[PDB]
Each structure stands twice: as C-alpha cells, then as structure tokens.
A paper describes a structure:
oxidoreductase family that is found in all three domains of life. trans-to-cis isomerization of the Ile75-Pro76 peptide bond. specific conformation and local environment of its active-site cysteine pair.
possible mechanism through the replacement of all prolines by alanine. rearrangements in the segments 39–41 and 92–95. Trx0P at 25 °C and pH 7.0. Trx WT, and that Trx0P is more oxidizing than Trx1P. redox potential of Trx0P relative to Trx WT and Trx1P. 75–76 bond thus made Trx0P a significantly worse substrate of TrxR. as DTT reduced Trx0P even faster than Trx WT. completely abolished the function of the protein as electron transfer catalyst. independent evidence for a Trx0P-like tertiary structure of Itrans.
Residue numbers in the entry: 3 to 108
C-alpha cells in the first residue's frame, strides 16, 4: 500500500491529499535510505487508517527534492493538508519511527 510518487504526481498524491502522508525521500546510493526502506512496509500496515506512506526517488525526481531542500540525504517528511507537519533526517529504527509518528499524528 505504499504510493509511488513522481514529480508529475506529487501535487495530487501528496499536497492535495486527504489524511496525513508520510513521504520517504530516497536514492539508490544511500545506505541510510535502505535502513528506512526496511521498516516502511510494516509501518504502513500498522498505521493503516490514519496514515498513507509514499516514496519519492530523488534521483529520478529532482524537482520535488529540490523544493524541500532534501540535498541527497535520507529524509522523511510528514504532510498534512499540503504542508510539512514534521521532519526526520537520516536513518532511524522501527522504534524511533513509531515515536516520530505517534508524536506527530493526531
């Protein structure tokens, strides 16, 4: 149930979205990105109903990565109503991601 994002679809899929959206900004040559990838599916399943998880490859979608100042580093942005509600940069554990979501979701 993870949404695949492109520069083309970001507005519709994320900014014009209903409900909180967790966007994972990632790249292939990025080790922290793989640690985050490893835990996203479980998280998506556990927060179904109050969160949607999405991925944007920043090598293929340089437009949106530039807009949010990603600068090539593993980044999670939580979106609500077209705005960034919370930010996490770099690798983190299943536990730290649960904390992040629980602290920043209703």
């Amino acid at each position: 149930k993870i949404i695949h994002l492109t520069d083309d679809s970001f507005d519709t899929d994320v900014l014009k979205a209903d409900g909180a959206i967790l966007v994972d900004f990632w790249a292939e040559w990025c080790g922290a990105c793989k640690m985050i990838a490893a835990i996203l599916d479980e998280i998506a399943d556990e927060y179904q109903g109050k969160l949607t998880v999405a991925k944007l490859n920043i090598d293929q979608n340089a437009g949106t990565a530039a807009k949010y100042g990603i600068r090539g580093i593993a980044t999670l942005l939580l979106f609500k109503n077209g705005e960034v509600a919370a930010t996490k940069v770099g690798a983190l554990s299943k536990g730290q991601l649960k904390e992040f979501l629980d602290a920043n979701l209703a």
